[PDB]
Every structure is written in C-alpha cells, then in structure tokens.
Design a protein around this ligand. Structure first.
Ligand SMILES: [Ca+2]
Ligand SMILES: [Ca+2]
Ligand SMILES: [Ca+2]
Ligand SMILES: [Ca+2]
Ligand SMILES: [Zn+2]
Length: 316
C-alpha cells in the first residue's frame, strides 16, 4: 500500500520483543519499505489461499498471540535481507531488490513452511511437532534461500541436485542464524521443533546421523521418497559444509577448518557462478573447489580444506 514508513513493536513466537518496520495508511501494515522494494507479510487466516491479506493492525503494537508468527516472518525476512546485502552484496533474492512476501497462519495445524516459487509460506504447527515455524530464524532464512537458488543455480528439486538445493538452504539458514547472533548453532529448526522435547532439532549439520540422515556418500538414500531424499541426502553436503567451516575428523579424514565467513563466501560463489539446475554432488565439489580457487588461490589452505571436506564425506 501507499503510506508512510513507521516503526511498530511486538513479540515473536518465542516471546521476544522486537521492533518491526511497518507502513501507515489508516491501518499499520506489515510492510517494511526500508529494504529493497519492500518486505510484505500476509495473513492466510488458516486457509490455503495465497497470499491472503496484507497484515493490518490498528495500533502498531503486535503483542497478541495471533500476531507472533507474523512479527517473526516479517522481522526475520528483514534479517535475511540484511545478511545477503551486507555479506554478499546481493539485493534481495533476485539481486534486484525484488519485493519479499510471506504468509503466516497457513492452513490448520500445518507442520511445515516453504518457498513456493513466489513467496514464503508458514504453518502454525500442531503445537506438538511444531510451534509456528517462522519462529525459527534458520527456518525463515532456509526458505528465502530457496528463492536465491531459484534465481541463480536453479537446482532441480530432485535427487542429488535437490539435495544440494536443500543443503544450500540449511547452510545459509545457519549462516544467517550466526549473523543475527541469537543462540546460533549448526542444527536446523531447534527453536520451533517439538516444544515438549528439549535439545532436539529437525536436522543436524554437525552430525546428520543424529536425526537419521547420511553423513557419507556410501550411506546415501537411493529410493523415491522425499523427491529422491532431498532432505535426507542433504546431510552429506551439510556435513561437508560444517567440516569446511569448523574442521574435524570424519571417517578417518582430517579437515582443517577455515571458519563460517569463508564457507559462506565459497558456497555463495559456487551457487551464483558455477552450479547449474542439474549439478550433482561431484559437480558441487568441483564448483566449490573452483570458487575457493578464485577467492584464495589454487595453492591455498581454503582449497585444500574444501577437498578434504568432500573427501571426508566420500564425494570425489
Ligand atoms: Ca495491535
Ligand atoms: Ca539456534
Ligand atoms: Ca539453528
Ligand atoms: Ca524440541
Ligand atoms: Zn527447503
């Protein structure tokens, strides 16, 4: 809507207070004009029609329980935008400040969230498996990262290319979580997964096998479920990324860690410069080796560490 930029205050899914950029014109709308062509958050009202209605509020205070998933979808979209702009010089998901749209309260008790080719969409969870999913900064950044991939590599959402697509989202979801510096970790979805169980998460990058996912190519899933295991075989790539950053030994292969920032640089360049819609794991390794070579040189520690990390997970 046309209006004036304003600043409201509210509480997110975890009960934390934060300021949000809004727009005033009769109502206060969840419309942040400070980032690119804007960040817009919508109410899906428990339906599956999208986007729903642009979120309108009478007083610019967002403290109702119904408000919490919207506050966080809106705020964390902002943090993710800031990460890509400040860290990678990328303006929104298309690199041309495309408007970012999210819908919350999607369907009833919906235990998922997704990027649908046009926008991010968040369920409220059923209160057992999940609480509203936009409460997870890694979840928001994971979904917005699918948009980045759509506009760059275009990794097909099946088999190996799909597992890379997924890992790319977990990698940058995590790097955004670190960027915000709010209880950061190498787990995925821990802030919104299973409110009845402490200490678990949907996936682990540091130890994928913790939650049933492979951490070596020899243990890859070869069947047809989950689009050929896109959320399963992502553990192999997640593990390699974790190792590149943090180092360690894994199946008797030693990796010298180079830190998060360089991991982010190498994988961002791989995603935007080398990967293609049909890239496989082997091709990802090559893309990452080439990216590290461009940035740090062929004889660098960074290149050597990329090779050791892929060696460790059995990807040549
Ligand atoms: Ca209000
Ligand atoms: Ca965390
Ligand atoms: Ca996390
Ligand atoms: Ca839990
Ligand atoms: Zn995903």
């Amino acid at each position: 809507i046309t209006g004036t930029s304003t600043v409201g205050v509210g509480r997110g899914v975890l009960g934390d207070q934060k300021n949000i950029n809004t727009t005033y014109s009769t109502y206060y709308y969840l419309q942040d004009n400070t980032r690119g062509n804007g960040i817009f958050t919508y109410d899906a009202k428990y339906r599956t029609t999208l986007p729903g209605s642009l979120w309108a509020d009478a007083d610019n205070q967002f403290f109702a329980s119904y408000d919490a998933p919207a506050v966080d979808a809106h705020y964390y979209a902002g943090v993710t935008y800031d990460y890509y702009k400040n860290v990678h010089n990328r303006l929104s998901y298309d690199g041309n400040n495309a408007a970012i749209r999210s819908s919350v309260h999607y369907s009833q008790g919906y235990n998922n969230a997704f990027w649908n080719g046009s926008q991010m969409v968040y369920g409220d969870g059923d209160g057992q498996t999940f609480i509203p999913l936009s409460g997870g900064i890694d979840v928001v950044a994971h979904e917005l990262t699918h948009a980045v991939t759509d506009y760059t590599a275009g990794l097909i959402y099946q088999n190996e290319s799909g597992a890379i697509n997924e890992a790319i989202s977990d990698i940058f979801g995590t790097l955004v979580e670190f960027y915000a510096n709010k209880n950061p970790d190498w787990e995925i979805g821990e802030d919104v997964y299973t409110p009845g169980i402490s200490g678990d998460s949907l996936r682990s990058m540091s130890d994928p096998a913790k939650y049933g996912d492979p951490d070596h190519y020899s243990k890859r899933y070869t069947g047809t479920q989950d689009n050929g295991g896109v959320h399963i075989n992502s553990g192999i790539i997640n593990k390699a990324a974790y190792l590149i950053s943090q180092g360690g030994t894994h199946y008797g292969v030693s990796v010298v860690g180079i830190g998060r920032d360089k991991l982010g640089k190498i994988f961002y360049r791989a995603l935007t410069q080398y990967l293609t819609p049909t890239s496989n794991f082997s091709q990802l390794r090559a893309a990452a080796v080439q990216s590290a070579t461009d940035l740090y040189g062929s004889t660098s520690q960074e290149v050597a560490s990329v090779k050791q990390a892929f060696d460790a997970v059995g990807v040549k």
